[PDB]
Amino acid sequence: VETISFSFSEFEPGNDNLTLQGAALITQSGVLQLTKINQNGMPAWDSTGRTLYTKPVHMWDSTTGTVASFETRFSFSIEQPYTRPLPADGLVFFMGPTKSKPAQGYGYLGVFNNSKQDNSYQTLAVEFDTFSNPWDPPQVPHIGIDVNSIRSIKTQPFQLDNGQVANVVIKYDAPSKILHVVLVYPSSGAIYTIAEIVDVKQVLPDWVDVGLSGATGAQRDAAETHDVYSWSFQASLPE
């Protein structure tokens, strides 16, 4: 079995294993701030940032046809401090082509280029979306499973517990092709679950980069924080 595994119980400036893109940065206190936090401690609009683990992950073997199973967990918080306008845009875990650069911001969350499905994206993503765009369900926030498109194949509304830490667990089982996602807020005890069938050998390239991305909005104060406190990942490809 070809395996890869990492675990950041907190982040540290200078860590060898993370690529930082766009606005993303790691604080001395150990927090990955995906989108810009201004001097006043307030989140900035028009910001997009991502992090990628530095080593690619082998998701399927082009010779034998084996396919990997994987699990990722992370803790994040989103604080929406402005009474108006509406907050935006969200954060997302994503897997796709290696040597990956940020895509479009705002509702595309730094991962996609427009709102059409395009199998060439070869990207699978799990979003926590805070702004209802023309292609979105009305309930925000919502968890979304995105396969080669920002228009989720399936969503599940969740109530934001403003500024509180959410724990996320995402598992993909190759034999069953089931991607299952869980969101828990220790603060309120709320638990959300969503699952869908995903054929990763069809969707993803055989090797991928894995990362997290966040975006704030297209007008003044359509913003919120996208802070991440820990992140772990494990994948196993049968041989």
Add this chain to the structure above:
Amino acid sequence: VETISFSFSEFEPGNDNLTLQGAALITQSGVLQLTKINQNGMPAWDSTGRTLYTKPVHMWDSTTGTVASFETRFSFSIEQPYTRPLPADGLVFFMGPTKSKPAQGYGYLGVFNNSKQDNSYQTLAVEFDTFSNPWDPPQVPHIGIDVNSIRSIKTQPFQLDNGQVANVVIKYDAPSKILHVVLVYPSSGAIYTIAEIVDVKQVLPDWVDVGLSGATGAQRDAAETHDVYSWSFQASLPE
């Protein structure tokens, strides 16, 4: 759509909507004790008890072929107070033939008759198993998805947080045939997830009873509590 829904935020002696079988009883404090708690407050061995909701649930239409999706949530605690012998046997959520009576106890958890697969059981169950029997994986406790057999098609180990309350969420989506299960311990923050493909039209009868069952062991003090604090359920069958 033909729907059925119930929610017990706590239990109350005399409630119209619950059938109590075997050792199960509801306390004045609002707790469903599935297995017997002795005068001294200690759990009794050789005990089996179940509860069933009083109305049957329509899981699939024998005429049109539609199939129901459903969700159930409940909170329970298991306290293993004896240093020896090993604790046993576990508790379980189950769906199967109506007019259902308790089956065999101990490792069969009040739901099955022996350890062989038998499609005639027409039963789907999600177990939280505390004793490793001859047909079980070694890690206990474990979550198990049981389809017509006490020998789970898939299991996931979990650490007991002794005497603490666990929150369970189980969802079945007919279109994808995915049964997904989540266990969370607010006390420790632990989160467990397990999912598998289940064809309910093949497994279950068109109408079922839904219930919870618990069992303690076959020798003195191979026992633990199986207390339930709340339970909700919702099913929708397309028309």
